[PDB]
Chains A and B, each alone.
Chain A
Amino acid sequence: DIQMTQSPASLSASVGETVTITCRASGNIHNYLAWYQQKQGKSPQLLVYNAKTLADGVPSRFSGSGSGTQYSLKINSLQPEDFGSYYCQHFWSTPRTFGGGTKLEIKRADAAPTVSIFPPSSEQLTSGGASVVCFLNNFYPKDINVKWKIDGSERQNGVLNSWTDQDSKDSTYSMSSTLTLTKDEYERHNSYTCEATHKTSTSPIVKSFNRNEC
């Protein structure tokens, strides 16, 4: 067997910059290595092979280099169409193994998120469940911490978060969060609050509602 280690796991750059993904084998491959490109929700495309040679119709800004055990990939002055995933594989020994993959994303001026809190629907209460939902839409740097306050103090029990991929149009991220409860648990409180603490400012974005407002 030969194993492939890649890195970084992810990195994010700006259009026009230069970038180097690397790749490292448990044995020697005497250059029998290939690199695939994977744009979001597409299948992988071969992009380089034998470490150095480019596949056809691959712009020249791509170079491969390396020998023996460490190889690497470099992209000169990025273009939007280059952002995606990148995998290396070897073709020396019989299981042709793959690198973990390096996820390449786009840099841009920081956005704060737009936070929207949503009570349960009557329909849902009818079923026996309640879920309070929070949209934290369209922000730059990918990370946020969310915080759910029932009534005033925290709750970390039944939360559930989903994150979008880097937006194609505008290079930003969004997050859905879903605090779920029994219809019965839910009809026992007043405050329901969502706190998004994020790079863009010091004090958190707070959005809440009170179960009394009709």
Chain B
Amino acid sequence: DVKLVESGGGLVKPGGSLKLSCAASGFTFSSYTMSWVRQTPEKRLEWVAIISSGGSYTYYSDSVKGRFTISRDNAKNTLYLQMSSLKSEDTAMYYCTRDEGNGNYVEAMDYWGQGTSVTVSSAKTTPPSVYPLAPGSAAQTNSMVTLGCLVKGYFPEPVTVTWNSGSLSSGVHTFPAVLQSDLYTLSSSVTVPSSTWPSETVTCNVAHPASSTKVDKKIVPR
């Protein structure tokens, strides 16, 4: 049962430094060639760097050459990526990856990690503001009724929205966040049969780990 587990992702300022690593369990580590592969916010995947099973030999995509350094501690069953001189453009999910064992040349990347996210930007960390979205005085008649709450002006990603401590999953929609110069804004929506609105508490829970924020909001009518 082969596993790759990356970690060390985080927020870093342009021209900063950060070091990703990947713990391999499952197979003889020093028997394989390894890589780091990234996926853009857009979702274009770009191979970045590769390394000898021994470790003394490396190779780099032009796009990182001389900025990034790949390495492995074979005894620690670990692969590393040292990043320096970070471009905003380096903002990606970084994937740790194994070259398959069997072809004369490498014929596939066998296995992937799950990835850690790296965001490079200068924008400072910020706690969100949660405001409720109650459907004010009008509409509503329908069997189902929609409520929501908006999570405004925070950085960086991610945020975690939940309705009544998770006990209202299905019928929820949390919208992808939107960068609004230096700051994120996301909204989320629940729908509930309206005969069990006001007189049944509906609260959302907003978690912003990056700045130690837990927030809840009753959804008081108008």
Residues of A that sit less than 8 Å from B by CB? 32, 34, 42-46, 49-50, 55, 85, 87, 89, 91, 94-98, 100-101, 114, 116-121, 123-124, 127, 129, 131, 133, 135, 137, 160-164, 169, 174-176, 178, 180, 207, 209-210, 213-214
Asked if B62 contacts A95 (CB within 8 A), the reply is yes
Contact partners of A121 in chain B: CB under 8 A: 131-134
Closest 10 CB pairs of A and B: A49-B108, A176-B175, A121-B131, A118-B133, A213-B137, A162-B175, A116-B146, A124-B131, A34-B108, A98-B45
Known: A96-B47, A98-B47, A169-B170. A46 touches B110 (CB 8 A): yes
Q: What residue in chain B is nearest A163 (Cβ atoms)?
A: B176
Contact partners of B112 in chain A: CB under 8 A: 43-45
Asked if B138 contacts A135 (CB within 8 A), the reply is no
Asked if A164 contacts B129 (CB within 8 A), the reply is no
Q: What residue in chain A is nearest B102 (Cβ atoms)?
A: A49
- Partner among B45, B103, B110, B133 whose Cβ is within 8 Å of the Cβ of A133: B133
Contact partners of A43 in chain B: CB under 8 A: 95, 112-115
A209 to B47, CA, bound (A): 51
Interface centre among B95, B136, B138, B222 (most CB of A within 10 A): B136
Q: What residue in chain A is nearest B188 (Cβ atoms)?
A: A176
- Partner among B95, B111, B135 whose Cβ is within 8 Å of the Cβ of A116: B135
Chain A nearest Cβ from B120, distance in angstroms: 21
Asked if B146 contacts A95 (CB within 8 A), the reply is no
Contact partners of A174 in chain B: CB under 8 A: 173, 175, 189
Contact partners of B113 in chain A: CB under 8 A: 43
Contact partners of A114 in chain B: CB under 8 A: 146, 191
Known: A164-B173, A164-B176. A137 touches B189 (CB 8 A): yes
Known: A49-B107, A98-B45, A178-B187. A123 touches B132 (CB 8 A): yes
30 contacts between A and B (CB under 8 A): A34-B109, A43-B112, A43-B113, A43-B114, A43-B115, A46-B100, A46-B109, A50-B107, A55-B108, A87-B45, A91-B106, A91-B107, A98-B44, A118-B135, A118-B136, A124-B152, A127-B129, A135-B148, A137-B146, A160-B185, A162-B186, A162-B187, A163-B176, A174-B173, A174-B189, A176-B173, A176-B187, A178-B178, A209-B136, A214-B136
A144 to B73, CA, bound (A): 52
Chain B nearest Cβ from A199, distance in angstroms: 20
Contact partners of A44 in chain B: CB under 8 A: 45, 95, 112
Contact partners of A91 in chain B: CB under 8 A: 105-108
Between A and B, how many residue pairs show CB distances below 8 Å? 132
A95 to B191, CA, bound (A): 49
Q: What residue in chain A is nearest B145 (Cβ atoms)?
A: A116
Contact partners of B59 in chain A: CB under 8 A: 94
A165 to B62, CA, bound (A): 33
- Partner among A133, A161, A162 whose Cβ is within 8 Å of the Cβ of B148: A133
B46 beta carbon closer than 8 Å to chain A: yes
A91 to B45, CA, bound (A): 15
Q: What residue in chain A is nearest B60 (Cβ atoms)?
A: A95
Asked if A98 contacts B131 (CB within 8 A), the reply is no
A176 to B150, CA, bound (A): 11
Chain A nearest Cβ from B97, distance in angstroms: 9
Contact partners of A117 in chain B: CB under 8 A: 135, 139
A213 to B135, CA, bound (A): 12
Contact partners of B18 in chain A: CB under 8 A: none
Known: A135-B146, A209-B138, A214-B222. A100 touches B107 (CB 8 A): no
Contact partners of B177 in chain A: CB under 8 A: 162
A45 to B95, CA, bound (A): 12
A96 to B185, CA, bound (A): 37
